[PDB]
Structure formats: structure tokens, C-alpha cells
Design a protein around this ligand. Structure first.
Ligand code: FMN
Ligand code: FMN
Ligand code: MG
Ligand code: MG
Lengths: 311, 311
């Protein structure tokens, strides 16, 4: 039922982890390989190892989560060596995804050169929307710098490339970004990264609940689904069909998954809910989507993919 | 207990309706006068009367609301004539607020000249952030145009003026906007307007729930409180103290109201939850705030106004 074709590869189902969640170490990754996730992605990496921000930096909320992790990761060379050893094994349907989130343009360019030069035959996600690093403005909110970066990348990078985007909230922002993205042989757009720089407050202690950046952190979960859906749909009706879409934001149930698919998402990433529930989520949400499909008499995703009705 | 001083005026309590909610007609407005709201504000107006967008354009959601009203209003001349007759009566503690949201800069300037030349002695709110008009972007996301408009406004407008802002999500946007706003004799900032251009979907009918703009509408309620708090707090620590703050977004209980005041909001506006409950809300939420204050041994709002603790 959920068999999906994406960046000319075949996956058993569209579900994945969202980068940052359950994907920091080799052992996290292997738990995802063993799960029913149709695919999976590494933690965004930087050139060097990073400890990240002081704790507490993530907290579960009734309606999702707040975090300011600070890009903790085990370094580029560590994720690259894991994914190289794992495509030699041919132990899974469809390739691994590999997120990079360089602290500068130059750092992203140098990681993208290393990936090009290497034998990696899977999928890269360039993260332009990391909101939890003190003193770096989300690059995908600066339309001139985003363009200038991508023109440079596409003079050498021939392998399958997507971009992880922050949420937009203005229809004209979607048009400006689509016009930039549409000039390149991009494989996909991933909407969305966290709703940036929100605040959660403990009213008894009269305090923020994370230590970094005075309590300001990216928001995820149910809080953000309306924005995520909107972002998936809005890019779906403006992007050239070569560029497909990963839906991310507020996915927890099969109905949530069904809504992203109806908007035009091809793959789906689960962050906050996976963090709460663990990899067992993939088996649960797969069966929820399937039962919704069976009730409506659908046997494949193409029956409703992108078919959200306007009134 | 909730006695509050704002724009050199005195209000019995910081609670207000948010513009657009329960303030369209003279009869709406009089029911707000009759309520416990400490103050109240008119529906944003334009120079001509407007029917607004096609229905359905407002929908109640488990976690808030979505709407694309399209600035329905009864025209500037109708609101002005109401507030003029109402300040003659001296029938309330503290002045009424008067929202304008001109479809162009020129239309905003013309209404602001009409307010200056009239005898209006209350408060004006320039809405720079209406997300539900087709073809007209949120202006307060265009920093050059926002600056250019305000410089023009302040060559003539000497009466009390605040601006209703859309949510920002990047710390640098906060700095760029505070440097703009701090160069003017502004009375206040009102953060926030709706989370712009989100989408809600009915999964059974596989459709959006509003007719305008293919289902895309401003999001309010619980969904947005992290963003609204963040914005209140972020301007609080950046704005020069002459410029105070109204906190709007996701206020339903005393605890929500407490959180906004702790961030540094002085007045508070209630949109979605007032739409759902009616003017009886003000009595309810006043009593919730009061019981929170009594538990904590607080007798006045200055005991915790602006006193959110970092970790
Ligand atoms: C703990 C935490 C760390 C994250 N780290 C990353 C990151 O490594 N790179 C990235 O592109 N997204 C990162 N994300 C954002 C998620 O990928 C996702 O876009 C966001 O959580 C919204 O999805 P959700 O509503 O299901 O949580 C992180 C999210 C959280 C929860
Ligand atoms: C029905 C609807 C119409 C609105 N009309 C206006 C408008 O006239 N001018 C304005 O500044 N805000 C308008 N708003 C936005 C609210 O003033 C407010 O910023 C938003 O609802 C966030 O508050 P809430 O979470 O309590 O709903 C409207 C909101 C809704 C719900
Ligand atoms: Mg597996
Ligand atoms: Mg009254």
C-alpha cells in the first residue's frame, strides 16, 4: 500500500525520522534500519565534533516540544564513514539520507565537495534553517545568500540534493523561493524545520524551561502542523515537478500523515513524536495510514497524493 | 489587583478584545463596554466599507482557529463617528482604541490625517500585519517599507500611536525592527497578529475548511502562544521603555495572561478565546489571574511584570 518512489529510488513506505531525532550515533541509526521506517536520515553534521548547547535543551510539551540543541553531532567524517560502510552491505531498500548543516557557507561547500568526491550514492540534505545556533540567522530567510550559495553548489555537486527549509508565512516568500529553487537540478525540498525562536514558560517557577538563548527554542509537534501543511502545499503548487517534497511537521497519527500526502508530500519525516515514542512509532503510524486508506478504498498513495480539494 | 497604567492612561485591568473579534458593529462595541474588559478596540478599518472574503472564512479548531476574513468592516467614517460620540459621554475608565489597516500606505496616511485633524483623544493602532487580504503582503515583513511609512506618519501624527505586528521567528528580525521602532515617539507595539498562512484540512472530505485563498488562513489560539510569548519577550528586552507592549496570542486562562505579563506585556488582547466564549470571558479570566496572584501573594502586576527568569 505505501510503496513510494522518490528521487528515482524505491522505498517500502514514505516514513522517516526527521534529522536531529534518533539519529546521533551509529546505534541510533541501526535502530532506525531495524524499524519499519521506509527510510532514515543522519543528524545534521558540521565539519568538526560539537558538544552543542548547555542543558536543559529539549523539553516535551503537551502540544509538542521545544529545543535548542545547538547542533550536537559526532562530526562529518563519522557520519560519512557510517553511510559508506552501510551501502556496501546492501542491507536495506533504498538509500540513506545524509544531512549537513555547516556553520558557514564555506563549511557547507567543503562538506559538499567531500560527498561528491566520495563513493556515497545516497541522498544529501543541505540544512539551511538551523535556528538553535547563537549568532547564525537561518540562511533560508536571506534570499540573496540562499541563491548565491546554491549557484555555487550546483557548479560541482551532481549527486541527489535536497534542502531543509524553515517555515514561511507570507505567500510572496513562497514565490521568491520557488523562483530560486526552480532554476536548479534539486531533487527535493523538505518543509518544515522548527517554528523558530518560540518561548515556553513554567508559570510556577516563573521561568523559561531551556537554558540556551534565554529559553528561546524551535517549536515542533501539533503546534506547527498548520504551518507545515501550508508550507508543503504552497511549494507543491509552485515547484517544478522534478523537485519533489518531504513533508515534516506535526506528524503523529495516520491522519496527520494523510494530510501531508494530500498536500503533495512524497516522503514524511517524524521528529517530536518519534522522540517521545521511539522507533516503534513507524509500525503504529503505518497501520493507521493503511486503515484510513482501506476505509476510503484506496490501495496506493497515488489515489490521493496531492489531491487536497479547495472549496 | 489588576489596575494598570498604559499610554499615560489608567485602566481597571489589562484585558481587551483583540481587533477583529467582537468589535465590528456599534452593538458589538457596546457589549465590550458593558463587559469587564479593562479596555477595547475597534475592528481594523479601511477608507471604504468592505464585505470581506467569501464564506466560510472562520473556523473553530480544537487548538485554536483559522480565518481569512478579508478585512470586513463598516468603514473608517463609521468607527470614527462612534468613538467621537463615545468620549463625549465619559462613560468608561480609559480611552477606546481605534484600529486602522489601510490597503495601501497612502490609505493609512489619509486615515491617520483624518484622526489627527479630528478631536479623537484615544489610542490609535496601525495594523501593519493583516495576512488575509489577497495580493497584499504583511508590510511589517518588509523593513524598508515599514520604516518609510513610519517616518512619513511621524512628520504629522502627534497623538498616541501603536503598531500591530506580525510574528517574527529570527532574532535578527527582532533587532532590525527594534532599531526602526526606537527612532519614533511610538506609544506601543502589539505582538502578535495571527500566524500567517497556515492551512487546516478536513481529512474525511479531503479539503480545506475555508474558501478564500485555497484554505490558507491566519492561525490563532493555543497553536501560537509560544510564538506570541517569544515576540512579546523579545521586543521587551529590545524596545526603549517609552514604547510599551500589548501581548496578543493564545490567551485563554489566567495562566496564559500571567505568562504574557511576565514577558513584559502591559495590556493583553484576547481573540480566538473571546470569539468562542463571548464577553463573559473577561470576568472569568480576571478571576483566574487574581487567584494566581493570591496563591503567590502578589497584590499588584508590578510584582512580576517583566520578571521572566532565564535558567
Ligand atoms: C531534538 C531536535 C533536534 C533537531 N535537530 C535537527 C537537525 O539536526 N537538523 C534538521 O534539519 N532538523 C532538526 N530538527 C527539526 C526536525 O527535523 C523537524 O523539522 C521539526 O522537529 C518539526 O518536526 P516535528 O513537528 O515532527 O517535530 C530537530 C528537532 C528536534 C526535535
Ligand atoms: C476573526 C479574526 C479577525 C481578525 N481581525 C483582525 C484585524 O481586524 N486587525 C488586527 O490587528 N487583528 C485581527 N485579528 C488578529 C487578532 O487580533 C489576534 O492578533 C490573533 O487572533 C491572535 O490572538 P488569539 O490567539 O487570541 O486569537 C483577527 C483575528 C481573527 C480571529
Ligand atoms: Mg527497516
Ligand atoms: Mg466595562
Amino acid at each position: 500500500m505505501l510503496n513510494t518512489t522518490f528521487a528515482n529510488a524505491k522505498f517500502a513506505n514514505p516514513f522517516m525520522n526527521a534529522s536531529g531525532v534518533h539519529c546521533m550515533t551509529i546505534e541510533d541509526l541501526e535502530e532506525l534500519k531495524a524499524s519499519q521506517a521506509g527510510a532514515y536520515i543522519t543528524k545534521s553534521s558540521t565539519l568538526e565534533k560539537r558538544e552543542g548547547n548547555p542543558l536543559p535543551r529539549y523539553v516535551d510539551l503537551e502540544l509538542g516540544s521545544i529545543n535548542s540543541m545547538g547542533l550536537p553531532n559526532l562530526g562529518f567524517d563519522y557520519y560519512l564513514d557510517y553511510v559508506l560502510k552501510n551501502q556496501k552491505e546492501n542491507a536495506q531498500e533504498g538509500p540513506i539520507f545524509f544531512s549537513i548543516a555547516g556553520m558557514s557557507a564555506a563549511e557547507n561547500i567543503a562538506m559538499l565537495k567531500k560527498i561528491q568526491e566520495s563513493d556515497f550514492s545516497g541522498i544529501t540534505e543541505l540544512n539551511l534553517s538551523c535556528p538553535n545556533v547563537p549568532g547564525k540567522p537561518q540562511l533560508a530567510y536571506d534570499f540573496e545568500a540562499t541563491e548565491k550559495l546554491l549557484k555555487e553548489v550546483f557548479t560541482f555537486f551532481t549527486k541527489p540534493l535536497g534542502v531543509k527549509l524553515p517555515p514561511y508565512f507570507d505567500l510572496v516568500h513562497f514565490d521568491i523561493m520557488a523562483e530560486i529553487l526552480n532554476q536548479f537540478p534539486l531533487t527535493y525540498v523538505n518543509s518544515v524545520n522548527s517554528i523558530g525562536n518560540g518561548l515556553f514558560i513554567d508559570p510556577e517557577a516563573e521561568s523559561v524551561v531551556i537554558k540556551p538563548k534565554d529559553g528561546f527554542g524551535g517549536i515542533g509537534g501539533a503546534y506547527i502542523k498548520p504551518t507545515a501543511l501550508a508550507n508543503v502545499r504552497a511549494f507543491y503548487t509552485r515547484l517544478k515537478p522534478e523537485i519533489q517534497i518531504i513533508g515534516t511537521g506535526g506528524i503523529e497519527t495516520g491522519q496527520d500523515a494523510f494530510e501531508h500526502l494530500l498536500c503533495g508530500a512524497t516522503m514524511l519525516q517524524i521528529g517530536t513524536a518519534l522522540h517521545k515514542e521511539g522507533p516503534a512509532i513507524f509500525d503504529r503510524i503505518i497501520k493507521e495510514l493503511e486503515e484510513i486508506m482501506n476505509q476510503k478504498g484506496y490501495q496506493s498513495i497515488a489515489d490521493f497524493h496531492g489531491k487536497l480539494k479547495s472549496l
